[PDB]
Amino acid sequence: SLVVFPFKHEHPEVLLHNVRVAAAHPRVHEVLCIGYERDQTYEAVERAAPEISRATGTPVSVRLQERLGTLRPGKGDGMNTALRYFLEETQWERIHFYDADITSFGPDWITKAEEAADFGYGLVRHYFPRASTDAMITWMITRTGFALLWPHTELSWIEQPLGGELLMRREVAAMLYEDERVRRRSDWGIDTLYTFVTVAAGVSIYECYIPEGKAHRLYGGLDDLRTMLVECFAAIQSLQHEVVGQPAIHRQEHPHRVPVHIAERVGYDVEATLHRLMQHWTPRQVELLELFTTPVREGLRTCQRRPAFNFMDEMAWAATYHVLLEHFQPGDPDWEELLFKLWTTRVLNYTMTVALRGYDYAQQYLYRMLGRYRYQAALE
Ligand SMILES: Nc1nc2c(ncn2[C@@H]2O[C@H](COP(=O)(O)OP(=O)(O)O)[C@@H](O)[C@H]2O)c(=O)[nH]1
Numbered sequence: 001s002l003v004v005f006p007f008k009h010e011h012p013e014v015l016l017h018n019v020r021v022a023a024a025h026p027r028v029h030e031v032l033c034i035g036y037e038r039d040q041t042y043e044a045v046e047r048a049a050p051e052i053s054r055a056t057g058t059p060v061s062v063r064l065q066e067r068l069g070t071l072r073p074g075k076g077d078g079m080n081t082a083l084r085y086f087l088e089e090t091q092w093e094r095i096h097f098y099d100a101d102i103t104s105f106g107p108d109w110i111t112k113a114e115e116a117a118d119f120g121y122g123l124v125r126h127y128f129p130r131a132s133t134d135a136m137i138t139w140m141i142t143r144t145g146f147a148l149l150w151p152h153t154e155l156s157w158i159e160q161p162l163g164g165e166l167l168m169r170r171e172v173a174a175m176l177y178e179d180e181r182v183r184r185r186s187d188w189g190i191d192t193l194y195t196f197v198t199v200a201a202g203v204s205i206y207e208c209y210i211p212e213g214k215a216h217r218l219y220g221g222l223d224d225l226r227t228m229l230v231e232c233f234a235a236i237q238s239l240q241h242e243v244v245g246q247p248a249i250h251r252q253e254h255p256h257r258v259p260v261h262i263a264e265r266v267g268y269d270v271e272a273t274l275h276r277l278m279q280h281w282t283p284r285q286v287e288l289l290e291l292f293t294t295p296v297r298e299g300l301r302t303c304q305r306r307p308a309f310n311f312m313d314e315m316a317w318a319a320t321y322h323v324l325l326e327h328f329q330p331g332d333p334d335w336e337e338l339l340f341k342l343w344t345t346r347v348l349n350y351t352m353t354v355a356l357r358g359y360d361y362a363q364q365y366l367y368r369m370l371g372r373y374r375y376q377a378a379l380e
């Protein structure tokens with residue numbers, strides 16, 4: 001198999017460790033690191049490369065991402081450049097992706113995936129336990145969107161649609177490299193694209209569970225995620241009129257109980273997030289609210305004077321979602337900030353009226369949210 005780690009600003013030690021793990025694995029026949037730019041990490045890898053290759057019998061290659069798409073040049077270009085290398089410069093039967101910044105990586109990751117592929121699945125997705133205030137894009141944007149737009153489909157049932165850890169059969173990779181909507185998505189929307197398209201094409205999917213969780217880079221306040229938020233919402237938006245094919249087999253490994261350290265983690269700085277809600281206002285944003293339902297309009301307007309979020313419950317979010325699908329303009333600075341504030345109030349609502357009632361309570365809620373969304377959408 002080919003194992004790929006795409007990287008941007010990672011520390012060298014962290015990535016080289018993971019490369020060492022993959023290179024040591026009996027089933028891995030090459031590893032490719034795909035860099036955003038040539039930096040300290042890129043060079044570090046390049047010189048450790050031929051030395052790891054002889055100690056293991058596995059070639060390791062570094063390469064720059066190239067401009068294959070047309071949105072922000074970001075992770076998409078990275079993964080697609082990797083697709084091209086896999087498909088055009090090698091004859092390997094399978095391709096693995098794993099985020100570069102993982103600190104809990106081990107060979108069972110690889111093993112579990114390969115075995116599932118042996119079992120016959122076209123695509124294998126690693127999923128993990130996550131803290132109840134993490135994954136807020138995943139739930140509030142990606143899964144919610146898939147549920148509101150494609151209720152009868154397998155799409156909202158994917159556990160981790162933004163997740164970067166996965167394995168594909170060659171033909172699946174080829175199919176994806178050849179799909180214009182996929183190639184286009186050079187920014188953060190790549191994972192959403194791979195998820196959507198593999199499902200839509202009737203690829204057979206297995207989601208295997210990694211109990212240890214994903215130890216990666218940590219994040220402080222909510223606006224760390226702002227670009228990602230817009231790009232991820234954009235991705236859904238652009239798919240909104242697509243149609244989905246007959247589904248294949250979709251099965252998911254049963255999840256273990258959550259590590260205590262994970263159930264006990266807090267995803268963001270509440271104070272700072274409340275502060276941020278009252279910032280970066282413009283008259284244009286205030287006028288743009290006129291597009292929204294009264295409680296959302298009035299809700300968000302209050303945020304100019306003081307933080308408000310009780311209004312942003314599950315129904316209000318769905319209504320807000322429909323307006324955004326219709327009027328949101330990627331590239332528009334005001335729409336971008338409005339989406340951010342708006343998502344922000346949803347997260348806070350969820351944090352105080354759900355996450356605070358406890359981990360299990362939150363998880364049960366989130367799944368029931370999707371359920372209710374799926375059911376509402378299929379009546380209209
Ligand atoms: N090649 C490439 N890799 C990227 C880019 N942006 C992010 N990455 C990598 O994609 C993976 C996910 O990035 P990260 O910020 O840690 O994702 P997150 O944990 O979900 O917030 C990591 O391996 C990053 O190094 C990019 O523009 N190009």
Ligand SMILES: [Mn+2]
Nearest residue numbers: 099101216217
């Ligand atoms: Mn990460």
